[PDB]
């Protein structure tokens, strides 16, 4: 509702970034266990669904086989983790700027 | 498919006959190219040796 929805868009984006960060950290910590499949969430589609709304995570394609059945690749996971952290901080900065502007309007 | 593990493996054996020396003992025998003396193994089933 007005202020609520305008802030809600960025709040939901930030929450989705946090959940994706949690999934990435989980599948990085679990990177040395046989029989594990790397998981991730389609951020753009998930955010679009939530904006007009319990996340539907999906598997990640392997790049080179391993006998033990592990599909998590450390370099790709690290790059994705860094990208997600930067996106999270960017969203935090945008949200903080909007809130600070809204507060300063009342002064 | 890039990773290609390597595992050691041993085929049966090499059947080249070894060098034999003459000790003149009355009951020391040496086989032919593909000979085999049959003995009774511990379990009972027959086995082959040289």
mmCIF file with all atom_site columns, C-alpha atoms in Angstrom:
data_model
loop_
_atom_site.group_PDB
_atom_site.id
_atom_site.type_symbol
_atom_site.label_atom_id
_atom_site.label_alt_id
_atom_site.label_comp_id
_atom_site.label_asym_id
_atom_site.label_entity_id
_atom_site.label_seq_id
_atom_site.pdbx_PDB_ins_code
_atom_site.Cartn_x
_atom_site.Cartn_y
_atom_site.Cartn_z
_atom_site.occupancy
_atom_site.B_iso_or_equiv
_atom_site.pdbx_formal_charge
_atom_site.auth_seq_id
_atom_site.auth_comp_id
_atom_site.auth_asym_id
_atom_site.auth_atom_id
_atom_site.pdbx_PDB_model_num
ATOM 1   C CA . UNK A 1 1   ? 0.000  0.000   0.000   1.00 0.00 ? 1   UNK A CA 1
ATOM 2   C CA . UNK A 1 2   ? 1.815  3.056   -1.382  1.00 0.00 ? 2   UNK A CA 1
ATOM 3   C CA . UNK A 1 3   ? 4.886  3.283   0.845   1.00 0.00 ? 3   UNK A CA 1
ATOM 4   C CA . UNK A 1 4   ? 4.434  -0.384  1.734   1.00 0.00 ? 4   UNK A CA 1
ATOM 5   C CA . UNK A 1 5   ? 4.505  -1.645  -1.862  1.00 0.00 ? 5   UNK A CA 1
ATOM 6   C CA . UNK A 1 6   ? 7.207  0.779   -3.014  1.00 0.00 ? 6   UNK A CA 1
ATOM 7   C CA . UNK A 1 7   ? 9.507  -0.473  -0.267  1.00 0.00 ? 7   UNK A CA 1
ATOM 8   C CA . UNK A 1 8   ? 8.165  -4.020  -0.661  1.00 0.00 ? 8   UNK A CA 1
ATOM 9   C CA . UNK A 1 9   ? 9.619  -4.469  -4.130  1.00 0.00 ? 9   UNK A CA 1
ATOM 10  C CA . UNK A 1 10  ? 13.176 -3.887  -2.919  1.00 0.00 ? 10  UNK A CA 1
ATOM 11  C CA . UNK A 1 11  ? 12.528 -5.738  0.341   1.00 0.00 ? 11  UNK A CA 1
ATOM 12  C CA . UNK A 1 12  ? 11.461 -8.847  -1.579  1.00 0.00 ? 12  UNK A CA 1
ATOM 13  C CA . UNK A 1 13  ? 14.444 -8.522  -3.908  1.00 0.00 ? 13  UNK A CA 1
ATOM 14  C CA . UNK A 1 14  ? 16.760 -8.358  -0.888  1.00 0.00 ? 14  UNK A CA 1
ATOM 15  C CA . UNK A 1 15  ? 15.074 -11.339 0.772   1.00 0.00 ? 15  UNK A CA 1
ATOM 16  C CA . UNK A 1 16  ? 15.425 -13.384 -2.414  1.00 0.00 ? 16  UNK A CA 1
ATOM 17  C CA . UNK A 1 17  ? 19.103 -12.438 -2.578  1.00 0.00 ? 17  UNK A CA 1
ATOM 18  C CA . UNK A 1 18  ? 19.499 -13.605 1.022   1.00 0.00 ? 18  UNK A CA 1
ATOM 19  C CA . UNK A 1 19  ? 17.830 -16.956 0.332   1.00 0.00 ? 19  UNK A CA 1
ATOM 20  C CA . UNK A 1 20  ? 19.960 -17.503 -2.774  1.00 0.00 ? 20  UNK A CA 1
ATOM 21  C CA . UNK A 1 21  ? 23.018 -16.667 -0.671  1.00 0.00 ? 21  UNK A CA 1
ATOM 22  C CA . UNK A 1 22  ? 21.929 -19.286 1.855   1.00 0.00 ? 22  UNK A CA 1
ATOM 23  C CA . UNK A 1 23  ? 21.558 -21.909 -0.875  1.00 0.00 ? 23  UNK A CA 1
ATOM 24  C CA . UNK A 1 24  ? 24.961 -21.042 -2.350  1.00 0.00 ? 24  UNK A CA 1
ATOM 25  C CA . UNK A 1 25  ? 26.646 -21.236 1.053   1.00 0.00 ? 25  UNK A CA 1
ATOM 26  C CA . UNK A 1 26  ? 24.970 -24.587 1.711   1.00 0.00 ? 26  UNK A CA 1
ATOM 27  C CA . UNK A 1 27  ? 26.123 -26.102 -1.568  1.00 0.00 ? 27  UNK A CA 1
ATOM 28  C CA . UNK A 1 28  ? 29.630 -24.682 -1.093  1.00 0.00 ? 28  UNK A CA 1
ATOM 29  C CA . UNK A 1 29  ? 29.949 -26.113 2.419   1.00 0.00 ? 29  UNK A CA 1
ATOM 30  C CA . UNK A 1 30  ? 28.618 -29.425 1.080   1.00 0.00 ? 30  UNK A CA 1
ATOM 31  C CA . UNK A 1 31  ? 31.041 -29.436 -1.860  1.00 0.00 ? 31  UNK A CA 1
ATOM 32  C CA . UNK A 1 32  ? 32.980 -32.535 -0.744  1.00 0.00 ? 32  UNK A CA 1
ATOM 33  C CA . UNK A 1 33  ? 30.236 -35.136 -0.267  1.00 0.00 ? 33  UNK A CA 1
ATOM 34  C CA . UNK A 1 34  ? 29.544 -37.885 -2.832  1.00 0.00 ? 34  UNK A CA 1
ATOM 35  C CA . UNK A 1 35  ? 26.052 -38.150 -4.246  1.00 0.00 ? 35  UNK A CA 1
ATOM 36  C CA . UNK A 1 36  ? 25.260 -34.437 -3.950  1.00 0.00 ? 36  UNK A CA 1
ATOM 37  C CA . UNK A 1 37  ? 23.666 -32.346 -6.699  1.00 0.00 ? 37  UNK A CA 1
ATOM 38  C CA . UNK A 1 38  ? 24.311 -28.616 -6.945  1.00 0.00 ? 38  UNK A CA 1
ATOM 39  C CA . UNK A 1 39  ? 21.142 -26.562 -6.519  1.00 0.00 ? 39  UNK A CA 1
ATOM 40  C CA . UNK A 1 40  ? 20.209 -23.003 -7.449  1.00 0.00 ? 40  UNK A CA 1
ATOM 41  C CA . UNK A 1 41  ? 17.154 -20.797 -7.930  1.00 0.00 ? 41  UNK A CA 1
ATOM 42  C CA . UNK A 1 42  ? 16.286 -18.865 -11.090 1.00 0.00 ? 42  UNK A CA 1
ATOM 43  C CA . UNK A 1 43  ? 16.559 -15.422 -9.531  1.00 0.00 ? 43  UNK A CA 1
ATOM 44  C CA . UNK A 1 44  ? 14.845 -13.389 -12.254 1.00 0.00 ? 44  UNK A CA 1
ATOM 45  C CA . UNK A 1 45  ? 11.829 -15.666 -12.706 1.00 0.00 ? 45  UNK A CA 1
ATOM 46  C CA . UNK A 1 46  ? 11.472 -16.201 -8.959  1.00 0.00 ? 46  UNK A CA 1
ATOM 47  C CA . UNK A 1 47  ? 11.535 -12.453 -8.302  1.00 0.00 ? 47  UNK A CA 1
ATOM 48  C CA . UNK A 1 48  ? 8.969  -11.858 -11.044 1.00 0.00 ? 48  UNK A CA 1
ATOM 49  C CA . UNK A 1 49  ? 6.676  -14.486 -9.524  1.00 0.00 ? 49  UNK A CA 1
ATOM 50  C CA . UNK A 1 50  ? 7.092  -13.130 -5.989  1.00 0.00 ? 50  UNK A CA 1
ATOM 51  C CA . UNK A 1 51  ? 6.418  -9.550  -7.100  1.00 0.00 ? 51  UNK A CA 1
ATOM 52  C CA . UNK A 1 52  ? 2.883  -10.597 -8.102  1.00 0.00 ? 52  UNK A CA 1
ATOM 53  C CA . UNK A 1 53  ? 2.520  -13.250 -5.375  1.00 0.00 ? 53  UNK A CA 1
ATOM 54  C CA . UNK A 1 54  ? 8.528  -21.867 -0.655  1.00 0.00 ? 54  UNK A CA 1
ATOM 55  C CA . UNK A 1 55  ? 11.068 -21.430 -3.455  1.00 0.00 ? 55  UNK A CA 1
ATOM 56  C CA . UNK A 1 56  ? 11.408 -23.871 -6.366  1.00 0.00 ? 56  UNK A CA 1
ATOM 57  C CA . UNK A 1 57  ? 15.100 -24.740 -6.468  1.00 0.00 ? 57  UNK A CA 1
ATOM 58  C CA . UNK A 1 58  ? 16.432 -26.668 -9.463  1.00 0.00 ? 58  UNK A CA 1
ATOM 59  C CA . UNK A 1 59  ? 19.549 -28.670 -10.226 1.00 0.00 ? 59  UNK A CA 1
ATOM 60  C CA . UNK A 1 60  ? 22.632 -27.319 -11.977 1.00 0.00 ? 60  UNK A CA 1
ATOM 61  C CA . UNK A 1 61  ? 24.130 -29.029 -15.021 1.00 0.00 ? 61  UNK A CA 1
ATOM 62  C CA . UNK A 1 62  ? 27.546 -30.611 -14.384 1.00 0.00 ? 62  UNK A CA 1
ATOM 63  C CA . UNK A 1 63  ? 30.569 -29.606 -16.423 1.00 0.00 ? 63  UNK A CA 1
ATOM 64  C CA . UNK A 1 64  ? 32.907 -32.583 -15.945 1.00 0.00 ? 64  UNK A CA 1
ATOM 65  C CA . UNK A 1 65  ? 32.125 -35.978 -14.400 1.00 0.00 ? 65  UNK A CA 1
ATOM 66  C CA . UNK A 1 66  ? 33.409 -37.200 -11.052 1.00 0.00 ? 66  UNK A CA 1
ATOM 67  C CA . UNK A 1 67  ? 33.276 -40.828 -9.956  1.00 0.00 ? 67  UNK A CA 1
ATOM 68  C CA . UNK A 1 68  ? 31.848 -40.094 -6.503  1.00 0.00 ? 68  UNK A CA 1
ATOM 69  C CA . UNK A 1 69  ? 28.835 -38.325 -8.022  1.00 0.00 ? 69  UNK A CA 1
ATOM 70  C CA . UNK A 1 70  ? 29.611 -34.748 -6.993  1.00 0.00 ? 70  UNK A CA 1
ATOM 71  C CA . UNK A 1 71  ? 28.419 -32.024 -9.360  1.00 0.00 ? 71  UNK A CA 1
ATOM 72  C CA . UNK A 1 72  ? 29.349 -28.881 -7.405  1.00 0.00 ? 72  UNK A CA 1
ATOM 73  C CA . UNK A 1 73  ? 32.265 -27.029 -9.009  1.00 0.00 ? 73  UNK A CA 1
ATOM 74  C CA . UNK A 1 74  ? 34.167 -24.797 -6.611  1.00 0.00 ? 74  UNK A CA 1
ATOM 75  C CA . UNK A 1 75  ? 35.244 -22.087 -9.058  1.00 0.00 ? 75  UNK A CA 1
ATOM 76  C CA . UNK A 1 76  ? 31.757 -21.585 -10.492 1.00 0.00 ? 76  UNK A CA 1
ATOM 77  C CA . UNK A 1 77  ? 30.246 -21.600 -7.007  1.00 0.00 ? 77  UNK A CA 1
ATOM 78  C CA . UNK A 1 78  ? 32.764 -19.006 -5.806  1.00 0.00 ? 78  UNK A CA 1
ATOM 79  C CA . UNK A 1 79  ? 32.054 -16.735 -8.774  1.00 0.00 ? 79  UNK A CA 1
ATOM 80  C CA . UNK A 1 80  ? 28.309 -17.033 -8.181  1.00 0.00 ? 80  UNK A CA 1
ATOM 81  C CA . UNK A 1 81  ? 28.804 -16.338 -4.467  1.00 0.00 ? 81  UNK A CA 1
ATOM 82  C CA . UNK A 1 82  ? 30.774 -13.167 -5.190  1.00 0.00 ? 82  UNK A CA 1
ATOM 83  C CA . UNK A 1 83  ? 28.175 -12.013 -7.721  1.00 0.00 ? 83  UNK A CA 1
ATOM 84  C CA . UNK A 1 84  ? 25.357 -12.621 -5.245  1.00 0.00 ? 84  UNK A CA 1
ATOM 85  C CA . UNK A 1 85  ? 27.185 -10.752 -2.480  1.00 0.00 ? 85  UNK A CA 1
ATOM 86  C CA . UNK A 1 86  ? 27.726 -7.749  -4.746  1.00 0.00 ? 86  UNK A CA 1
ATOM 87  C CA . UNK A 1 87  ? 24.074 -7.787  -5.819  1.00 0.00 ? 87  UNK A CA 1
ATOM 88  C CA . UNK A 1 88  ? 22.979 -7.997  -2.178  1.00 0.00 ? 88  UNK A CA 1
ATOM 89  C CA . UNK A 1 89  ? 25.108 -5.001  -1.236  1.00 0.00 ? 89  UNK A CA 1
ATOM 90  C CA . UNK A 1 90  ? 23.822 -3.051  -4.249  1.00 0.00 ? 90  UNK A CA 1
ATOM 91  C CA . UNK A 1 91  ? 20.224 -3.732  -3.258  1.00 0.00 ? 91  UNK A CA 1
ATOM 92  C CA . UNK A 1 92  ? 21.040 -2.748  0.314   1.00 0.00 ? 92  UNK A CA 1
ATOM 93  C CA . UNK A 1 93  ? 22.514 0.551   -0.878  1.00 0.00 ? 93  UNK A CA 1
ATOM 94  C CA . UNK A 1 94  ? 19.506 1.300   -3.091  1.00 0.00 ? 94  UNK A CA 1
ATOM 95  C CA . UNK A 1 95  ? 17.067 0.520   -0.276  1.00 0.00 ? 95  UNK A CA 1
ATOM 96  C CA . UNK A 1 96  ? 19.034 2.646   2.171   1.00 0.00 ? 96  UNK A CA 1
ATOM 97  C CA . UNK A 1 97  ? 19.113 5.544   -0.275  1.00 0.00 ? 97  UNK A CA 1
ATOM 98  C CA . UNK A 1 98  ? 15.346 5.349   -0.787  1.00 0.00 ? 98  UNK A CA 1
ATOM 99  C CA . UNK A 1 99  ? 14.693 5.223   2.959   1.00 0.00 ? 99  UNK A CA 1
ATOM 100 C CA . UNK A 1 100 ? 17.105 8.087   3.661   1.00 0.00 ? 100 UNK A CA 1
ATOM 101 C CA . UNK A 1 101 ? 15.467 10.216  0.981   1.00 0.00 ? 101 UNK A CA 1
ATOM 102 C CA . UNK A 1 102 ? 12.020 9.445   2.375   1.00 0.00 ? 102 UNK A CA 1
ATOM 103 C CA . UNK A 1 103 ? 13.187 10.407  5.864   1.00 0.00 ? 103 UNK A CA 1
ATOM 104 C CA . UNK A 1 104 ? 14.839 13.598  4.611   1.00 0.00 ? 104 UNK A CA 1
ATOM 105 C CA . UNK A 1 105 ? 11.654 14.651  2.804   1.00 0.00 ? 105 UNK A CA 1
ATOM 106 C CA . UNK A 1 106 ? 10.010 15.026  6.228   1.00 0.00 ? 106 UNK A CA 1
ATOM 107 C CA . UNK A 1 107 ? 12.707 17.533  7.249   1.00 0.00 ? 107 UNK A CA 1
ATOM 108 C CA . UNK B 2 1   ? 34.078 -36.565 -20.349 1.00 0.00 ? 1   UNK B CA 1
ATOM 109 C CA . UNK B 2 2   ? 37.640 -35.494 -19.523 1.00 0.00 ? 2   UNK B CA 1
ATOM 110 C CA . UNK B 2 3   ? 38.652 -37.188 -16.267 1.00 0.00 ? 3   UNK B CA 1
ATOM 111 C CA . UNK B 2 4   ? 40.119 -40.637 -16.953 1.00 0.00 ? 4   UNK B CA 1
ATOM 112 C CA . UNK B 2 5   ? 41.243 -42.532 -13.861 1.00 0.00 ? 5   UNK B CA 1
ATOM 113 C CA . UNK B 2 6   ? 43.940 -45.204 -14.038 1.00 0.00 ? 6   UNK B CA 1
ATOM 114 C CA . UNK B 2 7   ? 43.919 -48.507 -12.162 1.00 0.00 ? 7   UNK B CA 1
ATOM 115 C CA . UNK B 2 8   ? 46.668 -51.105 -12.007 1.00 0.00 ? 8   UNK B CA 1
ATOM 116 C CA . UNK B 2 9   ? 45.978 -54.541 -13.452 1.00 0.00 ? 9   UNK B CA 1
ATOM 117 C CA . UNK B 2 10  ? 47.874 -57.815 -13.793 1.00 0.00 ? 10  UNK B CA 1
ATOM 118 C CA . UNK B 2 11  ? 47.264 -60.335 -16.600 1.00 0.00 ? 11  UNK B CA 1
ATOM 119 C CA . UNK B 2 12  ? 47.650 -64.035 -15.834 1.00 0.00 ? 12  UNK B CA 1
ATOM 120 C CA . UNK B 2 13  ? 51.397 -64.676 -16.121 1.00 0.00 ? 13  UNK B CA 1
ATOM 121 C CA . UNK B 2 14  ? 54.306 -65.254 -18.506 1.00 0.00 ? 14  UNK B CA 1
ATOM 122 C CA . UNK B 2 15  ? 54.867 -68.878 -19.493 1.00 0.00 ? 15  UNK B CA 1
ATOM 123 C CA . UNK B 2 16  ? 58.447 -68.610 -20.741 1.00 0.00 ? 16  UNK B CA 1
ATOM 124 C CA . UNK B 2 17  ? 60.312 -71.618 -19.286 1.00 0.00 ? 17  UNK B CA 1
ATOM 125 C CA . UNK B 2 18  ? 63.140 -70.766 -16.932 1.00 0.00 ? 18  UNK B CA 1
ATOM 126 C CA . UNK B 2 19  ? 66.771 -71.786 -17.085 1.00 0.00 ? 19  UNK B CA 1
ATOM 127 C CA . UNK B 2 20  ? 67.462 -75.240 -15.664 1.00 0.00 ? 20  UNK B CA 1
ATOM 128 C CA . UNK B 2 21  ? 70.593 -76.554 -13.954 1.00 0.00 ? 21  UNK B CA 1
ATOM 129 C CA . UNK B 2 22  ? 71.794 -80.152 -13.739 1.00 0.00 ? 22  UNK B CA 1
ATOM 130 C CA . UNK B 2 23  ? 72.101 -81.266 -10.110 1.00 0.00 ? 23  UNK B CA 1
ATOM 131 C CA . UNK B 2 24  ? 72.198 -85.008 -10.979 1.00 0.00 ? 24  UNK B CA 1
ATOM 132 C CA . UNK B 2 25  ? 69.694 -85.743 -8.205  1.00 0.00 ? 25  UNK B CA 1
ATOM 133 C CA . UNK B 2 26  ? 67.855 -88.981 -9.098  1.00 0.00 ? 26  UNK B CA 1
ATOM 134 C CA . UNK B 2 27  ? 64.322 -87.563 -8.752  1.00 0.00 ? 27  UNK B CA 1
ATOM 135 C CA . UNK B 2 28  ? 64.467 -83.933 -9.884  1.00 0.00 ? 28  UNK B CA 1
ATOM 136 C CA . UNK B 2 29  ? 62.368 -83.339 -12.993 1.00 0.00 ? 29  UNK B CA 1
ATOM 137 C CA . UNK B 2 30  ? 61.907 -80.501 -15.470 1.00 0.00 ? 30  UNK B CA 1
ATOM 138 C CA . UNK B 2 31  ? 58.891 -80.216 -17.741 1.00 0.00 ? 31  UNK B CA 1
ATOM 139 C CA . UNK B 2 32  ? 58.560 -79.531 -21.467 1.00 0.00 ? 32  UNK B CA 1
ATOM 140 C CA . UNK B 2 33  ? 57.508 -76.193 -22.973 1.00 0.00 ? 33  UNK B CA 1
ATOM 141 C CA . UNK B 2 34  ? 53.916 -76.504 -21.715 1.00 0.00 ? 34  UNK B CA 1
ATOM 142 C CA . UNK B 2 35  ? 54.194 -79.220 -19.094 1.00 0.00 ? 35  UNK B CA 1
ATOM 143 C CA . UNK B 2 36  ? 52.481 -79.197 -15.712 1.00 0.00 ? 36  UNK B CA 1
ATOM 144 C CA . UNK B 2 37  ? 52.832 -81.511 -12.725 1.00 0.00 ? 37  UNK B CA 1
ATOM 145 C CA . UNK B 2 38  ? 49.525 -82.151 -10.970 1.00 0.00 ? 38  UNK B CA 1
ATOM 146 C CA . UNK B 2 39  ? 49.446 -81.967 -7.172  1.00 0.00 ? 39  UNK B CA 1
ATOM 147 C CA . UNK B 2 40  ? 46.688 -82.212 -4.580  1.00 0.00 ? 40  UNK B CA 1
ATOM 148 C CA . UNK B 2 41  ? 46.066 -78.794 -3.050  1.00 0.00 ? 41  UNK B CA 1
ATOM 149 C CA . UNK B 2 42  ? 45.123 -78.296 0.594   1.00 0.00 ? 42  UNK B CA 1
ATOM 150 C CA . UNK B 2 43  ? 41.405 -77.866 -0.126  1.00 0.00 ? 43  UNK B CA 1
ATOM 151 C CA . UNK B 2 44  ? 41.454 -81.101 -2.165  1.00 0.00 ? 44  UNK B CA 1
ATOM 152 C CA . UNK B 2 45  ? 40.983 -79.764 -5.693  1.00 0.00 ? 45  UNK B CA 1
ATOM 153 C CA . UNK B 2 46  ? 43.872 -80.617 -7.988  1.00 0.00 ? 46  UNK B CA 1
ATOM 154 C CA . UNK B 2 47  ? 46.326 -77.923 -9.004  1.00 0.00 ? 47  UNK B CA 1
ATOM 155 C CA . UNK B 2 48  ? 49.125 -77.548 -11.521 1.00 0.00 ? 48  UNK B CA 1
ATOM 156 C CA . UNK B 2 49  ? 52.717 -76.493 -10.915 1.00 0.00 ? 49  UNK B CA 1
ATOM 157 C CA . UNK B 2 50  ? 56.210 -76.717 -12.393 1.00 0.00 ? 50  UNK B CA 1
#
